[PDB]
Coordinates of N, CA and C and ligand atoms in Angstrom, one line a residue:
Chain A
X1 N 5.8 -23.4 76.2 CA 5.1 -24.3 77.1 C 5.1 -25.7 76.5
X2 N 4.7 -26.7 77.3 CA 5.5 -28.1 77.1 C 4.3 -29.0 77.1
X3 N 3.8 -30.0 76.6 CA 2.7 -30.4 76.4 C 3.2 -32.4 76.3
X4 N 2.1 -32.6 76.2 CA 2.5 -34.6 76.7 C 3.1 -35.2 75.2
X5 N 3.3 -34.3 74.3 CA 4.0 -35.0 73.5 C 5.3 -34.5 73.1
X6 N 6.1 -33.9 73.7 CA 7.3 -33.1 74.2 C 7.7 -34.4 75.0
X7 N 6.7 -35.2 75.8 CA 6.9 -36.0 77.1 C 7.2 -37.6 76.2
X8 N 6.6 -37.6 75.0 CA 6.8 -38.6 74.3 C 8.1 -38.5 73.7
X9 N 8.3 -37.8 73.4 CA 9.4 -37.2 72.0 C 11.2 -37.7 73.8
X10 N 10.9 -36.8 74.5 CA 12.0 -36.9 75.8 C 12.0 -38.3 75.7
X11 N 10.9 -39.4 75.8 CA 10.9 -40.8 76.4 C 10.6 -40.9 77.2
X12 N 9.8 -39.8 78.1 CA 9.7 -39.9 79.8 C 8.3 -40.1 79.9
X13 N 7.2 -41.0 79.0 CA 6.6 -41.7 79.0 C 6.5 -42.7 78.1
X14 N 5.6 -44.0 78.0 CA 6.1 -44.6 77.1 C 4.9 -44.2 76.0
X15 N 4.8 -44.8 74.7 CA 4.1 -45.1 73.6 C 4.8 -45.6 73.2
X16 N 3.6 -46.8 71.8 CA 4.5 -47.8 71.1 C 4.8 -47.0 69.8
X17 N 6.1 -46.9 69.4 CA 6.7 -46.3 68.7 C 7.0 -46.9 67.1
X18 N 6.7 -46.2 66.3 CA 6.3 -46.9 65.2 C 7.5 -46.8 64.0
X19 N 8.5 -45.7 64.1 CA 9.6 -45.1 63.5 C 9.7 -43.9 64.3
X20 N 11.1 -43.7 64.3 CA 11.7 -42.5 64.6 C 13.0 -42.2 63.3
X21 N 13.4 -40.4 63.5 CA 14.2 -40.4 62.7 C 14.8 -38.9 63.4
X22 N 16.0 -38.2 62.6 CA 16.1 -37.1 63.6 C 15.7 -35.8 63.4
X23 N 13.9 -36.1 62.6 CA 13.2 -34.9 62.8 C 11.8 -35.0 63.0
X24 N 11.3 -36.2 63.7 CA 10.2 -36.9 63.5 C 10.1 -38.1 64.0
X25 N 8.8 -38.4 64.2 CA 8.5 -39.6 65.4 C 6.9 -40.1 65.3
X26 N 6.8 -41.4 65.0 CA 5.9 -41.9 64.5 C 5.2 -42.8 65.6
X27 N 4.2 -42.6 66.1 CA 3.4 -43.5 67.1 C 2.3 -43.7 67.6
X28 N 1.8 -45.0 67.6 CA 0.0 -45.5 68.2 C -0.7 -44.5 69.1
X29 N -1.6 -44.1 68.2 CA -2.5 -42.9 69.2 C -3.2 -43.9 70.5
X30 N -3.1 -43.4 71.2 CA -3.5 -44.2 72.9 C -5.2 -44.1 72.5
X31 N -5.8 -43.0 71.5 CA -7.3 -43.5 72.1 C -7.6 -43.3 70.4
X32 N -7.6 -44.8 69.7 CA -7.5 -45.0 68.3 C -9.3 -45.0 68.0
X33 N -9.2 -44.5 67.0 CA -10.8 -44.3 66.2 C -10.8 -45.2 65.1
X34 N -9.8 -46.1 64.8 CA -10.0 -46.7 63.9 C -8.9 -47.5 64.2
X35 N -9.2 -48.9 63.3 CA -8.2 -50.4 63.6 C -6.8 -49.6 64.0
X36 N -6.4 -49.2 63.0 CA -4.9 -48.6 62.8 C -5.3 -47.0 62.8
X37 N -4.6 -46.5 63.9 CA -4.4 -45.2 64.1 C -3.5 -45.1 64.6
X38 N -2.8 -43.9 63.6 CA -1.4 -43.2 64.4 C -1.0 -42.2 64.3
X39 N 0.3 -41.5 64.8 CA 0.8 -40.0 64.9 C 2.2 -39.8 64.0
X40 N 2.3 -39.0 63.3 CA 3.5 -38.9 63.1 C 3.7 -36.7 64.3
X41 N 4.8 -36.7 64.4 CA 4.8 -35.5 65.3 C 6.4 -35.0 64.3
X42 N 6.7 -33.9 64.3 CA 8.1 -33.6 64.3 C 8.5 -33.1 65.2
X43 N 10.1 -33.3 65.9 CA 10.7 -33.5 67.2 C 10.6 -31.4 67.4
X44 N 10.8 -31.0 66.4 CA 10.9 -29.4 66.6 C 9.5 -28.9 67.0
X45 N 9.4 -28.1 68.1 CA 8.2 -27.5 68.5 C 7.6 -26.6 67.9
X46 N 6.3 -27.1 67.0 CA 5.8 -25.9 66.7 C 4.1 -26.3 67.3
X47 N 3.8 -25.3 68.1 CA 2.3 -25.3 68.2 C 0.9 -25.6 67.7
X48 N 1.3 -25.1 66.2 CA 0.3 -25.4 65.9 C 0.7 -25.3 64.0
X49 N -0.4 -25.6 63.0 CA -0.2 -25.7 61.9 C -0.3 -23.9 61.3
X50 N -0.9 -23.0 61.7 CA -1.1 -21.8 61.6 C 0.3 -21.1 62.0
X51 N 1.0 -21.5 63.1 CA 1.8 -20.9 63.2 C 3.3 -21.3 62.5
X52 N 3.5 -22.5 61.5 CA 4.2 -22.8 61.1 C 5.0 -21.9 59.9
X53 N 6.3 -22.0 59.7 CA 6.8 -20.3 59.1 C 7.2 -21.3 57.2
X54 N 7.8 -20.6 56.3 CA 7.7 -21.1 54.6 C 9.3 -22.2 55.2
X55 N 9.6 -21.8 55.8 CA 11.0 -23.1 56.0 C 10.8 -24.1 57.1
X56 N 9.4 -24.4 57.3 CA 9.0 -26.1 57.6 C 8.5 -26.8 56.6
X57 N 8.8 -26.2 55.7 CA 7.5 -26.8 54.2 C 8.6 -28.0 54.4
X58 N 10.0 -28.2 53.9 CA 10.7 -29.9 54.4 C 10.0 -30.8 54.9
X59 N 9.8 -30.0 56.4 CA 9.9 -30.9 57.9 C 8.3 -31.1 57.8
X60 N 7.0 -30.4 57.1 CA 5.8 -31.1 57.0 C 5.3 -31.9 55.8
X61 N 6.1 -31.8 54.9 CA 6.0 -32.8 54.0 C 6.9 -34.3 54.7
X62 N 7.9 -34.1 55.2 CA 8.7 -35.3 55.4 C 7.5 -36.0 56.5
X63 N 6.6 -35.4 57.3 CA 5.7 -35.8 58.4 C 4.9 -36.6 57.4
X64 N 4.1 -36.2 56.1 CA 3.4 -36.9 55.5 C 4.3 -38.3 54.6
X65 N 5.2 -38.3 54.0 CA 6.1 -39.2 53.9 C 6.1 -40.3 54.8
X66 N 6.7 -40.1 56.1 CA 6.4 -40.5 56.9 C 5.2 -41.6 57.1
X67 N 4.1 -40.6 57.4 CA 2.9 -41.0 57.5 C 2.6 -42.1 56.4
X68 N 3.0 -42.1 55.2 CA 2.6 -43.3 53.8 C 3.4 -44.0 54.1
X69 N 5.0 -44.4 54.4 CA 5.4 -45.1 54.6 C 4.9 -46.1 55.5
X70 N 5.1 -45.9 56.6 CA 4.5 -46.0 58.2 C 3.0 -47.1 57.8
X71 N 2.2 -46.1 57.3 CA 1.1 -46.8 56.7 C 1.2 -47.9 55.9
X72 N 2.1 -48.2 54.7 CA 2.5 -49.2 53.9 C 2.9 -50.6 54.5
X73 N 3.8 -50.4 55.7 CA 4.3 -51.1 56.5 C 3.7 -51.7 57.6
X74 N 2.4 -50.9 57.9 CA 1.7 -51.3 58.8 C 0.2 -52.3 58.6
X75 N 0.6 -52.4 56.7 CA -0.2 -53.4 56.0 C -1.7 -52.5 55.6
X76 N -1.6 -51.1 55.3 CA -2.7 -50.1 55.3 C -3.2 -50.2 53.6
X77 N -3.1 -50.9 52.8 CA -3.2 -51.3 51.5 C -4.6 -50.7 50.7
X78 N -5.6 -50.9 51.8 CA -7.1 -50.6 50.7 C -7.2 -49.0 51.3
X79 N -6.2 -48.0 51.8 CA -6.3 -47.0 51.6 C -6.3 -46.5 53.4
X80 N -6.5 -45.0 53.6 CA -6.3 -44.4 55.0 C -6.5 -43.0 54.7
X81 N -6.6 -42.0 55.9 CA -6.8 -40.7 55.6 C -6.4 -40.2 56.3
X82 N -5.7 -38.9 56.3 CA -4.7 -38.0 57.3 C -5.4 -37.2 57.4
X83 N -4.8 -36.8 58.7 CA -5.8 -35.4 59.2 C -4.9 -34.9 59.7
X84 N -4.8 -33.4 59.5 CA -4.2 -32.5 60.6 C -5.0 -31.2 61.1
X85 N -5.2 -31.2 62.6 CA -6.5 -30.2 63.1 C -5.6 -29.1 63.3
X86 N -6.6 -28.2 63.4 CA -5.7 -26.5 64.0 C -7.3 -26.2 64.7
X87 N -6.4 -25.8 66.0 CA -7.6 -24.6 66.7 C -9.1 -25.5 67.5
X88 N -9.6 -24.9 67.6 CA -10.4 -25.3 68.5 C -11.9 -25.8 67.4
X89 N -12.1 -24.7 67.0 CA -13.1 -25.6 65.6 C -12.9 -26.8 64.9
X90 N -11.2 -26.9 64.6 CA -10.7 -28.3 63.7 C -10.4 -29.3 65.1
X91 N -10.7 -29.1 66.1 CA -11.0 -29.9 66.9 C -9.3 -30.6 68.1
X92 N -8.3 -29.8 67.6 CA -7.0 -29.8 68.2 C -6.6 -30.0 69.4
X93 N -6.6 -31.0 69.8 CA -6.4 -31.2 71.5 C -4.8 -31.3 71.8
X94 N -3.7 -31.5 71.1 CA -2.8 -30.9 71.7 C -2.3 -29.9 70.9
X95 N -1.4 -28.9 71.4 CA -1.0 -27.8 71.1 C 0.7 -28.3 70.6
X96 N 1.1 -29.4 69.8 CA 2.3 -29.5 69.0 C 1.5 -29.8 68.0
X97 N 2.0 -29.3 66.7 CA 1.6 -30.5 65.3 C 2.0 -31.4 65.2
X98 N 0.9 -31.6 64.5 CA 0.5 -34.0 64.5 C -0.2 -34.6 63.6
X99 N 0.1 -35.1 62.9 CA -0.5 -35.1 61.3 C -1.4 -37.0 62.1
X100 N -2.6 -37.0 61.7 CA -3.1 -38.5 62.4 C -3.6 -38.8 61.0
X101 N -3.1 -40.7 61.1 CA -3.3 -41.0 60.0 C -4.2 -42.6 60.6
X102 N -5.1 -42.7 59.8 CA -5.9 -43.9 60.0 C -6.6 -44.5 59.3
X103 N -6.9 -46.0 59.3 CA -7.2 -47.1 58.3 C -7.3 -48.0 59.1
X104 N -8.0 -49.3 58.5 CA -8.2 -50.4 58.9 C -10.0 -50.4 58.7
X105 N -10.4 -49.5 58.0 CA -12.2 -49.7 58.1 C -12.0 -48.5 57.2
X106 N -13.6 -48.7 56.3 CA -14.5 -47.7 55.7 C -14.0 -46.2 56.4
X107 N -13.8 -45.1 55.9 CA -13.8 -43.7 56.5 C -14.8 -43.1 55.7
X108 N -15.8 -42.5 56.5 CA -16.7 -41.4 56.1 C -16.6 -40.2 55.7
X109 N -17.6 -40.3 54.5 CA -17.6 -38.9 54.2 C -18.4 -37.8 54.7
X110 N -18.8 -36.4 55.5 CA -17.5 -35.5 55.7 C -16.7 -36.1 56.9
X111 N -15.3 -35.5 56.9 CA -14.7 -36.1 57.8 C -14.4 -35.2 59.0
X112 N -16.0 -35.4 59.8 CA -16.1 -34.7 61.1 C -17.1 -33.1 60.7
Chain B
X1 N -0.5 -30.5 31.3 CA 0.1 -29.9 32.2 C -0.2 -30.3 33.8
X2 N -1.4 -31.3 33.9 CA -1.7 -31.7 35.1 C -2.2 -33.3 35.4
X3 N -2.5 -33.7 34.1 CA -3.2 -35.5 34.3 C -4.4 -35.6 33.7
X4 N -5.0 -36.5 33.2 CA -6.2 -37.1 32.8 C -7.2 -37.5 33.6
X5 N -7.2 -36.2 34.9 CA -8.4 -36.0 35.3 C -9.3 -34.6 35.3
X6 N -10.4 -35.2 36.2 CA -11.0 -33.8 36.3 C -10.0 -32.3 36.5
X7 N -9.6 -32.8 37.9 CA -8.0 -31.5 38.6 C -7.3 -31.4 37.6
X8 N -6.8 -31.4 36.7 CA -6.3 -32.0 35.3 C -6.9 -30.6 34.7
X9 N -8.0 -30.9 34.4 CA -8.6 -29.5 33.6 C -8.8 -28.3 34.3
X10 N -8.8 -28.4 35.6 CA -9.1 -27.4 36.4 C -7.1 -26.2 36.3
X11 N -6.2 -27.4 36.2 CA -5.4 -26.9 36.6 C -4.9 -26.4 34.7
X12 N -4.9 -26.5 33.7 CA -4.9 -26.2 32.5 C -6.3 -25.6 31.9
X13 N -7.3 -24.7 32.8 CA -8.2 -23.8 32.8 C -9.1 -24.2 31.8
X14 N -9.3 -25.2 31.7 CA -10.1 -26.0 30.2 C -11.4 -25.6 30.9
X15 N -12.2 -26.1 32.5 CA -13.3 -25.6 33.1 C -13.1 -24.6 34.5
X16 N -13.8 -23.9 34.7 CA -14.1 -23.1 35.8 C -13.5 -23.7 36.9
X17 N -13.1 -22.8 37.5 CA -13.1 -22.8 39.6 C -12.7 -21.8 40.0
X18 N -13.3 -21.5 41.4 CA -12.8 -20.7 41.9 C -11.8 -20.5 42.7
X19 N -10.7 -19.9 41.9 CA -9.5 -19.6 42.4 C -9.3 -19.4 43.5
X20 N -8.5 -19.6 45.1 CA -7.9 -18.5 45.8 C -6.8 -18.1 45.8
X21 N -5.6 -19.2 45.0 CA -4.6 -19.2 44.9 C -3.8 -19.8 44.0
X22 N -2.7 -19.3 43.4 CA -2.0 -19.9 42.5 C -0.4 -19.7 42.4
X23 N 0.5 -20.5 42.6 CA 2.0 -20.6 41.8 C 2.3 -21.8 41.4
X24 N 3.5 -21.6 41.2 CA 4.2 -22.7 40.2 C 4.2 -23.9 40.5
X25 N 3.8 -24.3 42.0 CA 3.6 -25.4 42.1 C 2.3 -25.9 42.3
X26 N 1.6 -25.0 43.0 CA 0.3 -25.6 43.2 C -1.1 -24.7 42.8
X27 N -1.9 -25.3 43.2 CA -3.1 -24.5 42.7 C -4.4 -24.9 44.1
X28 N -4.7 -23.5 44.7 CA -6.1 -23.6 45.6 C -7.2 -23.4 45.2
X29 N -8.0 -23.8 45.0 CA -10.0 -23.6 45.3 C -10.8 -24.3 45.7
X30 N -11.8 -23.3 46.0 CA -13.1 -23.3 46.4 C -13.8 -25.3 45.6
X31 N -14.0 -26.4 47.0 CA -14.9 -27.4 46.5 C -16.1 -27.1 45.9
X32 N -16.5 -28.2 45.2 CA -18.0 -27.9 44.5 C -18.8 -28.4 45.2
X33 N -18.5 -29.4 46.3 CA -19.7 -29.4 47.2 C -19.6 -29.3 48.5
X34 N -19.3 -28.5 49.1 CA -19.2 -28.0 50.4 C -19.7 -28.7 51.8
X35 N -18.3 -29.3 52.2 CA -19.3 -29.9 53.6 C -19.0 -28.4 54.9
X36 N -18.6 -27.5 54.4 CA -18.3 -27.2 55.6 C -18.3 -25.8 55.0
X37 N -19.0 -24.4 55.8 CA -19.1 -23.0 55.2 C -17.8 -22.4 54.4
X38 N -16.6 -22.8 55.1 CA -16.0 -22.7 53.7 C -15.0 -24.2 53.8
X39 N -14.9 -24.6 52.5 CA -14.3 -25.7 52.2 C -13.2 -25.7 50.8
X40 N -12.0 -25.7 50.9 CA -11.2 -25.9 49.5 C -10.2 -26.8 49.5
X41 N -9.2 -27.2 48.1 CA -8.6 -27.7 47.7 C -7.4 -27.1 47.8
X42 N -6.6 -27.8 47.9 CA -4.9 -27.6 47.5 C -4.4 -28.4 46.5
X43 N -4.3 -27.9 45.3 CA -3.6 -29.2 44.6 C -2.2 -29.2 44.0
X44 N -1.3 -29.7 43.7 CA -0.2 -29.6 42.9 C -0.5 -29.5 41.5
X45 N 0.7 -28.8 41.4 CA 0.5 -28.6 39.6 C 1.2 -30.2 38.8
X46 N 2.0 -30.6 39.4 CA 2.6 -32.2 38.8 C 1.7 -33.3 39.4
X47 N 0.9 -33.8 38.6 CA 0.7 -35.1 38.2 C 1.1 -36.4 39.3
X48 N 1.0 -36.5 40.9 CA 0.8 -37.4 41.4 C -0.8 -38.1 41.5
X49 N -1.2 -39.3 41.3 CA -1.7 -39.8 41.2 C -2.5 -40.1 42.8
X50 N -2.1 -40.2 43.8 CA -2.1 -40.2 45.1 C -1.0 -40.7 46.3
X51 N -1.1 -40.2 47.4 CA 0.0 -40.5 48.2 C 0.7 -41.4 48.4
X52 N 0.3 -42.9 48.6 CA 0.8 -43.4 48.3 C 2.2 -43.6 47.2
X53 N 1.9 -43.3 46.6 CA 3.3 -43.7 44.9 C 3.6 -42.1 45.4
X54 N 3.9 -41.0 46.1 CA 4.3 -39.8 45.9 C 6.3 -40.4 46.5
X55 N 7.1 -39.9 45.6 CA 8.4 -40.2 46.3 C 8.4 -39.3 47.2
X56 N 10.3 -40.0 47.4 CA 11.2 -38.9 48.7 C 11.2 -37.3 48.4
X57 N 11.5 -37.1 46.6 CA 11.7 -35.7 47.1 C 10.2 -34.9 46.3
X58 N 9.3 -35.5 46.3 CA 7.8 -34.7 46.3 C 8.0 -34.0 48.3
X59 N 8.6 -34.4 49.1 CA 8.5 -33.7 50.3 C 8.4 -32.5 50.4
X60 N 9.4 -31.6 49.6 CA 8.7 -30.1 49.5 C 7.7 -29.9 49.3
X61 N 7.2 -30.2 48.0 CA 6.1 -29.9 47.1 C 4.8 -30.8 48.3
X62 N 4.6 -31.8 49.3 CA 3.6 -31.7 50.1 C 3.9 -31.0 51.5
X63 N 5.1 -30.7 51.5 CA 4.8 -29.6 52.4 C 4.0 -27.9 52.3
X64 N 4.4 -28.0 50.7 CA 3.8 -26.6 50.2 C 2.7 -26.2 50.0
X65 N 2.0 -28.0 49.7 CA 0.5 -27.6 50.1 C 0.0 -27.2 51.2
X66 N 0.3 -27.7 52.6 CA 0.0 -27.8 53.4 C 0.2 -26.3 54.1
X67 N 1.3 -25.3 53.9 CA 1.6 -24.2 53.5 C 0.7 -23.2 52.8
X68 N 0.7 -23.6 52.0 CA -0.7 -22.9 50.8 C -1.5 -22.9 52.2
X69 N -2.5 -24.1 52.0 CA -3.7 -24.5 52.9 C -4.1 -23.8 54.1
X70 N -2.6 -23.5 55.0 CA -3.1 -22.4 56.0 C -2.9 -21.4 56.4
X71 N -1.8 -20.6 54.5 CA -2.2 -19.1 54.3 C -3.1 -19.0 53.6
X72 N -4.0 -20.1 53.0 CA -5.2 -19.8 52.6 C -6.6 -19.6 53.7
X73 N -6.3 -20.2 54.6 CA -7.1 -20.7 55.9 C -7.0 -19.1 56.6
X74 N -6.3 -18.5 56.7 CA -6.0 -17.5 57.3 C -6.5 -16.7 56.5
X75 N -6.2 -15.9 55.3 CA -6.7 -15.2 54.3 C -8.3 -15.2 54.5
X76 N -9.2 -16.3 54.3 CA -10.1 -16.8 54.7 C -10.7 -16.3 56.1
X77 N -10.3 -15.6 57.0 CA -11.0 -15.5 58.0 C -11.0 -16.4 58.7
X78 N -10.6 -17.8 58.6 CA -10.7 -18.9 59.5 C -9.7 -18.9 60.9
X79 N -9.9 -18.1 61.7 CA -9.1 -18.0 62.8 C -9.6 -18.8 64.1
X80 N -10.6 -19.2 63.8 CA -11.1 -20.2 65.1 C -10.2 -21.8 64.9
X81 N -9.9 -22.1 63.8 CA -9.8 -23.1 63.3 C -10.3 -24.0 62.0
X82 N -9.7 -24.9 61.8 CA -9.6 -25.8 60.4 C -9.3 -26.9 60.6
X83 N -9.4 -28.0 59.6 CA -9.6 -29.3 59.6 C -8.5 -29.6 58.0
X84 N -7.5 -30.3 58.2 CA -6.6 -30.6 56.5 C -6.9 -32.0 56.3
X85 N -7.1 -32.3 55.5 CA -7.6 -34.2 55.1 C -7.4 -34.4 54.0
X86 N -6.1 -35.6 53.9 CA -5.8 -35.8 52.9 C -6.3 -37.3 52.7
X87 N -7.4 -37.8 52.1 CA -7.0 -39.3 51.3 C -6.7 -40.2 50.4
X88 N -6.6 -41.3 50.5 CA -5.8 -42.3 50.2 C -6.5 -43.7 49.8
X89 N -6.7 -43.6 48.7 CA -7.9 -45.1 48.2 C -9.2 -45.3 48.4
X90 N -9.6 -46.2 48.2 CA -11.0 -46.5 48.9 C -11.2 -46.7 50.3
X91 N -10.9 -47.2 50.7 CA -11.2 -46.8 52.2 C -10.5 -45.4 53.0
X92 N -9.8 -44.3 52.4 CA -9.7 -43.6 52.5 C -11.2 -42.8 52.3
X93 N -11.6 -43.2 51.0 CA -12.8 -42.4 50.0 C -12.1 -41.5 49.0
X94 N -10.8 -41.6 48.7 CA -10.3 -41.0 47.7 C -11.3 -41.1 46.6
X95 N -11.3 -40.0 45.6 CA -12.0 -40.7 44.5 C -11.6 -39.7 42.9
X96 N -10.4 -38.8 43.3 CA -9.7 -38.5 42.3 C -8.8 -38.8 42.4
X97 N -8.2 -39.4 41.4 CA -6.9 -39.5 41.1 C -5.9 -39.0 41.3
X98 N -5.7 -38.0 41.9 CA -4.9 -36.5 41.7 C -4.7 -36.2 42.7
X99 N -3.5 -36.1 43.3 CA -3.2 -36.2 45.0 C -3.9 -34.4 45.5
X100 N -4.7 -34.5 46.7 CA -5.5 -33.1 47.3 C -5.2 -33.0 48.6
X101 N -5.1 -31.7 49.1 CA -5.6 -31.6 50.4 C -6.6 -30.5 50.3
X102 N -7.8 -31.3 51.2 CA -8.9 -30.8 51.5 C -8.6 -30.2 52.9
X103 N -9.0 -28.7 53.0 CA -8.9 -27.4 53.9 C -10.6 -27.0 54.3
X104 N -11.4 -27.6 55.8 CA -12.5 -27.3 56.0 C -12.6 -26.5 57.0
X105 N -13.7 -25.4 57.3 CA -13.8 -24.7 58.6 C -15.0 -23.6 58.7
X106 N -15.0 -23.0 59.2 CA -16.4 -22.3 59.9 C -17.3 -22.6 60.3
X107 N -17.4 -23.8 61.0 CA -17.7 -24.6 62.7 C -16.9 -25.6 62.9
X108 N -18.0 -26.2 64.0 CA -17.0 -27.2 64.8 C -17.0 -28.3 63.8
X109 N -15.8 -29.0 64.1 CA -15.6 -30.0 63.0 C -15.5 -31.4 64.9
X110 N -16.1 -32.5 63.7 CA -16.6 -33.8 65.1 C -15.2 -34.9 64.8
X111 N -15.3 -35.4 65.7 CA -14.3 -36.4 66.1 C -14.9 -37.9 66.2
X112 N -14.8 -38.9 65.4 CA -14.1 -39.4 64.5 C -14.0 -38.7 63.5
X113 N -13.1 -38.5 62.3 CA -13.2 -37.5 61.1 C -12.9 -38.3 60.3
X114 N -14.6 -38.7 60.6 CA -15.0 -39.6 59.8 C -14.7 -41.2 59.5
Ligands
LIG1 N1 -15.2 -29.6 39.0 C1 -14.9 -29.4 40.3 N2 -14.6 -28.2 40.9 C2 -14.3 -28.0 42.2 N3 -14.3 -29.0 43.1 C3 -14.5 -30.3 42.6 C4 -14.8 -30.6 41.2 N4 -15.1 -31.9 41.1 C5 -14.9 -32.5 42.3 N5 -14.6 -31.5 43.2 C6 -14.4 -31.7 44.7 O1 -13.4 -32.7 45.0 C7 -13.8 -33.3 46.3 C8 -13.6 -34.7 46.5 C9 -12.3 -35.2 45.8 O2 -12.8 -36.0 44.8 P1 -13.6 -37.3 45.1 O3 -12.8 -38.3 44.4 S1 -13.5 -37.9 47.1 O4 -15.1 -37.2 44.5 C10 -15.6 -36.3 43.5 C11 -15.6 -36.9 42.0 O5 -16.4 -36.1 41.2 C12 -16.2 -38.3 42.0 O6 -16.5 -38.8 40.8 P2 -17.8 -39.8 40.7 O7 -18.6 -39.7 41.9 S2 -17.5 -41.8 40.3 O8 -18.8 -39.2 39.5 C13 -19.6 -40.0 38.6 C14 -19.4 -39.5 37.2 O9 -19.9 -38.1 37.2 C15 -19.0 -37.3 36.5 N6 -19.0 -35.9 36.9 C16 -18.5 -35.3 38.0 N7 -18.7 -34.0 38.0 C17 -19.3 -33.7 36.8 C18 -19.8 -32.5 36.1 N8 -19.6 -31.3 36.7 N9 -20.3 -32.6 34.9 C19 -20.5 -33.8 34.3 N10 -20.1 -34.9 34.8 C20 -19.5 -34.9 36.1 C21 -17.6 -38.0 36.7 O10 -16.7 -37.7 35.6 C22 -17.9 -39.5 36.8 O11 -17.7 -40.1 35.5 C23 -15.3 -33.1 46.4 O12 -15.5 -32.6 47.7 C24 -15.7 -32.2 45.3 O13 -16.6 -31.2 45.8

């Protein structure tokens, strides 16, 4: 099943797009919690972080890569914090993984 | 075998933790202060300092945490869900040196995080 960021990844909506590459896709979360918030996604569907198998270890480290670069470039300097949710407790609203990275203010401690 | 920090001694057995997991690259346990019923670490066994400075080919090695983190998550009982947070400086609130991912769960976790 096919979820709205399948719909990003196609192009058949827009978002502002921060980097792309051909395993991975970097872009402005629509409802930002902080100055600079964003997504890195990888283009391969996987549901969720639980269900990911020992041969994406690559393709979710290259998402955090990603994510520091991205951040560097986007002038993120006095620091930022990644999150990636699973499930309904870690608070997961869509059902592809999505590593969210954010900065631009103070982050608290616990986080959530 | 790990850096001149605290995670440092933890990973060259000099003080205590509680283990959940261990290989050649990395090393899991139990936090010492718990925001969350259960809360742990993922750390590498090589000496990055934080994400930032981590190169191209550390990519495995943070994917493997991430890996660890939610066959540890699982092992754990944590089937409802989890929360992974990794940060990055001070305004991150980093405050070891020593690149982590923090693995939280057994309720709801809130939105901003933090
Ligand atoms: N020993 C440990 N075992 C398991 N988990 C540990 C741990 N030490 C820290 N953690 C976990 O890392 C997580 C955060 C990642 O590290 P942070 O950088 S965001 O903050 C923790 C760190 O301890 C901060 O140091 P600081 O707040 S400036 O401490 C002030 C001084 O107290 C010293 N200190 C800390 N722990 C001890 C201690 N157990 N005995 C004596 N001195 C200590 C420390 O060396 C420093 O000079 C925390 O959730 C914490 O529960």
């Amino acid at each position: 099943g096919d979820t709205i960021f399948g719909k990003i990844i196609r192009k058949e909506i827009p978002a502002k797009i921060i980097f792309e590459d051909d395993r991975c896709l970097a872009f402005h979360d629509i409802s930002p919690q902080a100055p600079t918030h964003f997504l890195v996604i990888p283009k391969k569907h996987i549901s969720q972080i639980s269900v990911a198998e020992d041969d994406d270890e690559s393709l979710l480290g290259h998402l955090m890569i990603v994510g520091k670069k991205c951040a560097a470039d986007l002038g993120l300097n006095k620091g930022y914090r990644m999150v990636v949710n699973e499930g309904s407790d870690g608070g997961q609203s869509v059902y592809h993984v999505h590593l969210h990275v954010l900065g631009g203010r103070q982050m608290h401690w616990p986080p959530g």
